[PDB]
Design a protein around this motif. Sequence first.
Motif, PDB file in Angstrom:
ATOM      1  N   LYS A  26      -5.108  -1.211   6.266  1.00  0.00           N
ATOM      2  CA  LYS A  26      -4.024  -0.954   7.262  1.00  0.00           C
ATOM      3  C   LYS A  26      -2.893  -1.990   7.104  1.00  0.00           C
ATOM      4  CE  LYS A  26      -6.046   2.423   9.675  1.00  0.00           C
ATOM      5  NZ  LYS A  26      -7.176   2.565   8.726  1.00  0.00           N
ATOM      6  N   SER A  27      -2.122  -1.936   6.007  1.00  0.00           N
ATOM      7  CA  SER A  27      -0.989  -2.850   5.728  1.00  0.00           C
ATOM      8  C   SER A  27      -0.097  -3.219   6.961  1.00  0.00           C
ATOM      9  CB  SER A  27      -0.084  -2.347   4.582  1.00  0.00           C
ATOM     10  N   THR A  28       0.252  -2.239   7.832  1.00  0.00           N
ATOM     11  CA  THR A  28       1.064  -2.389   9.093  1.00  0.00           C
ATOM     12  C   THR A  28       0.441  -3.446  10.031  1.00  0.00           C
ATOM     13  OG1 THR A  28       2.269  -1.192  10.796  1.00  0.00           O
ATOM     14  CG2 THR A  28       0.056  -0.377  10.330  1.00  0.00           C
TER      15      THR A  28
HETATM   16  O1  LIG Z   1      -0.489  -1.070   4.191  1.00  0.00           O
HETATM   17  P1  LIG Z   1       0.376   0.243   4.674  1.00  0.00           P
HETATM   18  O2  LIG Z   1       0.824   0.149   6.114  1.00  0.00           O
HETATM   19  O3  LIG Z   1      -0.509   1.454   4.480  1.00  0.00           O
HETATM   20  O4  LIG Z   1       1.699   0.301   3.716  1.00  0.00           O
HETATM   21  C1  LIG Z   1       2.315   1.524   3.461  1.00  0.00           C
HETATM   22  C2  LIG Z   1       2.516   1.673   1.938  1.00  0.00           C
HETATM   23  C3  LIG Z   1       3.723   0.837   1.465  1.00  0.00           C
HETATM   24  C4  LIG Z   1       1.284   1.134   1.194  1.00  0.00           C
HETATM   25  C5  LIG Z   1       2.711   3.167   1.545  1.00  0.00           C
HETATM   26  O5  LIG Z   1       1.526   3.930   1.675  1.00  0.00           O
HETATM   27  C6  LIG Z   1       3.758   3.954   2.341  1.00  0.00           C
HETATM   28  O6  LIG Z   1       4.117   3.648   3.433  1.00  0.00           O
HETATM   29  N1  LIG Z   1       4.283   5.123   1.673  1.00  0.00           N
HETATM   30  C7  LIG Z   1       5.242   6.017   2.289  1.00  0.00           C
HETATM   31  C8  LIG Z   1       6.654   5.883   1.756  1.00  0.00           C
HETATM   32  C9  LIG Z   1       7.479   4.663   2.085  1.00  0.00           C
HETATM   33  O7  LIG Z   1       7.327   4.080   3.106  1.00  0.00           O
HETATM   34  N2  LIG Z   1       8.464   4.315   1.080  1.00  0.00           N
HETATM   35  C10 LIG Z   1       9.312   3.161   1.233  1.00  0.00           C
HETATM   36  C11 LIG Z   1       8.415   1.946   1.058  1.00  0.00           C
HETATM   37  S1  LIG Z   1       9.317   0.438   0.630  1.00  0.00           S
HETATM   38  C12 LIG Z   1      10.113   0.487  -0.996  1.00  0.00           C
HETATM   39  O8  LIG Z   1      10.232   1.496  -1.617  1.00  0.00           O
HETATM   40  C13 LIG Z   1      10.625  -0.849  -1.502  1.00  0.00           C
HETATM   41  C14 LIG Z   1      10.900  -1.023  -2.761  1.00  0.00           C
HETATM   42  C15 LIG Z   1      11.429  -2.375  -3.203  1.00  0.00           C
END
Ligand SMILES: *OP(=O)(O)OCC(C)(C)[C@@H](O)C(=O)NCCC(=O)NCCSC(=O)/C=C/C
Lengths: 163, 48
Positions: A40-42
């Motif tokens: 849970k990255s958030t």
């Molecule tokens: O640990 P989590 O809360 O699960 O983090 C979310 C995670 C980044 C791992 C990913 O699954 C997610 O949120 N994907 C959906 C698309 C998104 O949010 N895209 C923008 C992310 S930031 C980016 O692209 C930065 C680049 C430098």
Amino acid sequence: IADEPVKASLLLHVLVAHKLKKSLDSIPMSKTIKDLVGGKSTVQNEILGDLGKEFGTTPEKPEETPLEELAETFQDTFSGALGKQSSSLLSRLISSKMPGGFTITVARKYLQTRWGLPSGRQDGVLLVALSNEPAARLGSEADAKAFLDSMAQKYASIVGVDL
Amino acid sequence: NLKGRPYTGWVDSKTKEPVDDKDVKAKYETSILEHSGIRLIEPELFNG
Ligand SMILES: *OP(=O)(O)OCC(C)(C)[C@@H](O)C(=O)NCCC(=O)NCCSC(=O)/C=C/C
């Protein structure tokens, strides 16, 4: 009694335990924030944001460093102060779960009179109180005094103080 | 890390206080000359 400043390893362990909504015993200090959180990255990034607001400067990659190495790296700069994030956590523990009239300073007077605990111990007793915040408000003053008394013995167990 | 800040260099061996190379001579030379060379026997060095 003796006024030793609150340890960073206890403070950090309380903030993580409060955020994950688990008992202080349920989080081992050997496990990393990335392992504990369970993908849970958030939640992990809200923990790193609480640590960054509490202490200030943080190590290079704190999510992969176990809570020990992270605790002692914070302690090298940690002035012993309550913090800003802990100010808000304790303000909202006292406002939301203590009976009407029973403020933070009245609890700070009670534990000083009852146990002879200075402001440096009373910080620690309030921090260990936060890590196991009760679900409902304690309506009666005597239940709030029984909780604070039970929390003092749990703090005394964790540090190694005999009352 | 040494008192929060990152330090690279000489420190006093007792107090861990940073010591600049320029200061080494004013801070230690008297003690160096006192405890070097031909001098009164020092029991600590010869098993009391
Ligand atoms: O640990 P989590 O809360 O699960 O983090 C979310 C995670 C980044 C791992 C990913 O699954 C997610 O949120 N994907 C959906 C698309 C998104 O949010 N895209 C923008 C992310 S930031 C980016 O692209 C930065 C680049 C430098």
